[PDB]
Write an enzyme that holds these catalytic residues in place. Sequence first.
Site, PDB file in Angstrom:
ATOM      1  N   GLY A 152      56.003  16.970  33.426  1.00 47.42           N
ATOM      2  CA  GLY A 152      54.944  16.761  34.408  1.00 47.42           C
ATOM      3  C   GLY A 152      53.673  16.038  34.004  1.00 47.42           C
ATOM      4  O   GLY A 152      53.714  15.001  33.335  1.00 47.42           O
TER       5      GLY A 152
ATOM      6  N   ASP B 279      55.482  25.513  20.992  1.00 44.93           N
ATOM      7  CA  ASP B 279      54.757  24.251  21.090  1.00 44.93           C
ATOM      8  C   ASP B 279      53.374  24.370  20.455  1.00 44.93           C
ATOM      9  O   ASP B 279      52.430  23.716  20.905  1.00 44.93           O
ATOM     10  CB  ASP B 279      54.678  23.787  22.562  1.00 44.93           C
ATOM     11  CG  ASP B 279      54.578  22.284  22.777  1.00 44.93           C
ATOM     12  OD1 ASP B 279      55.051  21.522  21.896  1.00 44.93           O
ATOM     13  OD2 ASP B 279      54.039  21.865  23.837  1.00 44.93           O
TER      14      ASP B 279
ATOM     15  N   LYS C  18      47.983  21.545  36.643  1.00 42.51           N
ATOM     16  CA  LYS C  18      49.268  21.185  36.047  1.00 42.51           C
ATOM     17  C   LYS C  18      50.325  21.077  37.154  1.00 42.51           C
ATOM     18  O   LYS C  18      50.545  22.032  37.895  1.00 42.51           O
ATOM     19  CB  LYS C  18      49.688  22.199  34.974  1.00 42.51           C
ATOM     20  CG  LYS C  18      50.984  21.831  34.253  1.00 42.51           C
ATOM     21  CD  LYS C  18      51.135  22.617  32.974  1.00 42.51           C
ATOM     22  CE  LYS C  18      52.311  22.154  32.168  1.00 42.51           C
ATOM     23  NZ  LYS C  18      52.363  22.848  30.859  1.00 42.51           N
TER      24      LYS C  18
ATOM     25  N   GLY D  88      52.229  16.039  29.617  1.00 43.50           N
ATOM     26  CA  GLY D  88      53.098  16.993  28.929  1.00 43.50           C
ATOM     27  C   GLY D  88      54.586  16.699  28.941  1.00 43.50           C
ATOM     28  O   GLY D  88      55.014  15.594  29.299  1.00 43.50           O
TER      29      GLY D  88
END
Length: 293
Positions: free
Chosen positions: A33, A142, A54, A30
């Site tokens: 990260g 996004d 994540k 992403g």
Amino acid sequence: IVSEKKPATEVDPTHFEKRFLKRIRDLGEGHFGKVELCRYDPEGDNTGEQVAVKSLKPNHIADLKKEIEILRNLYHENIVKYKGICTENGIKLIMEFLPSGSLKEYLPKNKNKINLKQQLKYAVQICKGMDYLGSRQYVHRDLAARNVLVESEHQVKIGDFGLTKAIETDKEYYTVKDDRDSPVFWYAPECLMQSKFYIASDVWSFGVTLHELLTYCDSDSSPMALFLKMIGPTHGQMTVTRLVNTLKEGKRLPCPPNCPDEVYQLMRKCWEFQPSNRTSFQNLIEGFEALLK
Ligand SMILES: N[C@H]1CC[C@@H](Nc2cc[nH]c(=O)c2-c2nc3ccccc3[nH]2)CC1
């Protein structure tokens, strides 16, 4: 000799111990990260649940914490489920694992399984999750097919909230300061020109996401590939200003192959130059439902 008495440890199901979180593979890379597939295996026998983790690559911890807090309080059938956290000041976001991945992975491999009716149903579900997000005064920023996870053949979920921002009460938009690296080919003109993000800006990105959905996420007909053919692929730092110019001229993405005009017209309603003239998520749901039966 003194020793502190220990009270009854109220075991937290949303707390995942680092020692039991075992990495299987990478799922995505992403904006800030990494996302990895892990197996939370406290019994150490490979029977533990598979989870999506994540985390950050070693500042931007503040953004991840805010993303965690947003997802923790979102509850909708079309929004990826928050499972918990893994604490150290470093933090890891634990989410449900959907083995089918995003539409980008799924659609090119399941064309024979997904017809126009199923594509319109996914569109309805994306709009419902997006409308739920909008009602809680949030801008996604996004919305792309790559951020739409497949739960099954009949269900999709918005699976990433890394750029999600809150719109202040008695205000219509959010002003971005860190507009790098923005998904420019998915953004409305007000986002590209003045770095302003309205709910209507997300409706524009939905139109683009719908175009990808109808093309079964084929790389050659991707919004980036198609817009670069319209403006030129060798403009470097002049790409965004040329993109703004092309949109001002009235140029929009073409009708996807085999897409009926009536679906393309709903897609066009998402692409009105002015945010105030654009369709809402509720009018899109109505529009798609009308074509479903
Ligand atoms: N494209 C971005 C979508 C958001 C993130 N991915 C998530 C998030 C939360 N839960 C998940 O199950 C996944 C997931 N990605 C997969 C990629 C291949 C295969 C399975 C996958 N699952 C990062 C990649």
